[PDB]
C-alpha cells in the first residue's frame, strides 16, 4: 500500500491560463485557498485569482503590479509596483494600507494570517496589517545571500527565528544560501541549504515544546536533511538531539535539488519535494526516511501547506495542482511491513494517536 495519498486538484490550463504564466514569478500560491496568476492579455496586464473552492470561476481584474500575493485566508491582496506597495480588500473594493519602500522588494510573502514579509536587496522587513503599522526591518541581509535569487522566507511559530533562502549557480550546480536569524539574540548564521521549515515538537518528558528547524541540502556531501532544536530549550525541557540523514538523489536527477518542505504537526512528518518532482517522507522525530517516489514529471515551483489533510500542496510548470498527504489508513502497516520498522511503526501510532 502507500504511506501517502496523492491527488490532482487542478489543471490551470483547463481554466485558460497561458502556460507561459505558470511559473515562479507570475503564479503565486500563499495558501491552499487561492492561486493568483499575472497575465498580459492584450496590451493590458491583469490578475486572475482562482478560489480553490470554486476553480471553475476564476475572476479577472486589471492590475499594473509586477507582483501579486493573496492573503492566506481572505480576498485581501498585496500588489506591488516597484517600490510602491498596496493592500486591497477585493470584496470591499478598498485600499487597506499603502506604503512606499526606499528600495525595491525582490521577494515578499505572507508569513501569518496578517503579516507580510518584504525582502529588499539588503534587508528583511515584517509588515503587520494590524492597525496603522508600517514595515519593520527585522535584520540586515548576510553577505552570503548577496547575488543569490531569493526564493523563500520562513518563520518559526513565535516569529523568533527567521530563515531567508537564496540560490545560485556555482561550479555548475545550484548552491543554496540560507540565513538563520535569532530575534532574541540579534545574531545571524549562514547555512548551506535548499529547503527547510520550522516545527513545534513536545519531546516526551518535557513540559514545554521544542522549536525545531529542519532543512535539506544537496551540498558537496551529496544530499542531507538535518533536524535540530533552535534556540535554548525551555527552562526545564531536555534538549532535542540533532538528527541528520541522507536524502537520496537517483543518477538521472543530476542537477535536481530540494525545493520545498512542509511539516505536519499532525503526524510529525516532513514532506520534502525536489525541483524536478520527487517526494520524500521523513519522521520529524527520528528523521527516519519513511517513503520516496516520483509525483510530478514537470518541475515544481511553489507549494503551501495543504490544511484539510496536513499534507503539502503545489503547482508544477504544467499547471497541475497536486497534493500529497499522509494516508492515515496505512502509514502504520506500511512502516511495519513494507519498511519492516516495527519500532518507528509502534511509535508513530502511539505518538500521533493513529493506527
Amino acid at each position: 500500500i502507500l504511506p501517502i495519498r496523492f491527488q490532482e486538484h487542478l489543471q490551470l490550463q483547463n481554466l485558460g491560463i497561458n502556460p507561459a504564466n505558470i511559473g515562479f514569478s507570475t503564479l503565486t500560491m500563499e495558501s491552499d485557498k487561492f492561486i493568483c496568476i499575472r497575465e498580459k492579455v492584450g496590451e493590458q496586464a491583469q490578475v486572475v485569482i482562482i478560489d480553490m473552492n470554486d476553480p471553475s470561476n476564476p475572476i479577472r481584474r486589471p492590475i499594473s503590479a509586477d507582483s501579486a500575493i493573496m492573503n492566506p485566508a481572505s480576498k485581501v491582496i498585496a500588489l506591488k509596483a516597484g517600490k510602491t506597495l498596496q493592500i486591497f480588500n477585493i470584496e470591499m473594493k478598498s485600499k487597506m494600507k499603502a506604503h512606499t519602500m526606499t528600495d525595491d522588494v525582490t521577494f515578499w510573502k505572507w508569513i501569518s494570517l496578517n503579516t507580510v514579509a518584504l525582502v529588499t536587496d539588503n534587508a528583511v522587513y515584517h509588515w503587520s496589517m494590524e492597525g496603522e503599522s508600517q514595515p519593520v526591518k527585522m535584520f540586515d541581509r548576510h553577505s552570503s545571500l548577496a547575488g543569490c535569487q531569493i526564493i523563500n522566507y520562513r518563520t518559526d511559530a513565535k516569529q523568533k527565528w527567521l530563515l531567508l533562502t537564496g540560490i545560485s549557480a556555482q561550479q555548475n550546480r545550484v548552491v543554496g544560501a540560507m540565513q538563520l536569524y535569532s530575534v532574541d539574540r540579534k545574531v545571524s548564521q549562514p547555512i548551506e541549504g535548499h529547503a527547510a521549515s520550522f516545527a513545534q515538537f513536545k519531546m516526551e518528558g518535557n513540559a514545554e515544546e521544542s522549536t525545531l528547524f529542519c532543512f535539506a541540502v544537496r551540498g558537496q556531501a551529496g544530499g542531507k536533511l538535518h533536524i535540530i532544536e533552535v534556540g535554548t530549550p525551555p527552562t526545564g525541557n531536555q534538549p532535542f538531539p540533532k538528527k541528520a540523514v541522507d536524502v537520496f538523489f537517483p543518477p538521472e536527477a543530476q542537477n535536481d535539488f530540494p525545493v520545498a518542505m512542509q511539516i505536519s504537526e499532525k503526524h510529525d512528518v516532513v514532506f520534502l519535494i525536489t525541483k524536478y518532482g520527487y517526494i520524500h517522507l521523513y519522521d520529524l522525530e527520528t528523521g527516519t526516511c519513511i517513503y520516496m517516489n516520483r509525483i510530478s514529471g514537470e518541475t515544481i515551483f511553489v507549494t503551501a501547506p495543504h490544511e484539510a489533510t496536513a499534507g503539502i500542496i503545489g503547482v508544477n510548470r504544467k499547471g497541475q495542482v497536486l497534493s500529497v498527504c499522509v494516508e492515515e489508513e496505512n502509514i502504520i502497516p506500511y512502516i511495519t511491513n513494507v519498511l519492516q520498522n516495527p519500532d518507528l511503526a509502534l511509535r508513530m501510532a502511539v505518538r500521533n494517536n493513529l493506527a
Binding site: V47, R61, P62, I63, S64, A65, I77, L79, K80, A81, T84, Q86, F88, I90, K93, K95, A98
Partner: peptide, 7 residues
C-alpha cells in the same frame, strides 16, 4: 495610484 482596478 491605484495598482488595482476593481471597478
Amino acid at each position: 495610484v491605484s495598482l488595482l482596478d476593481l471597478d
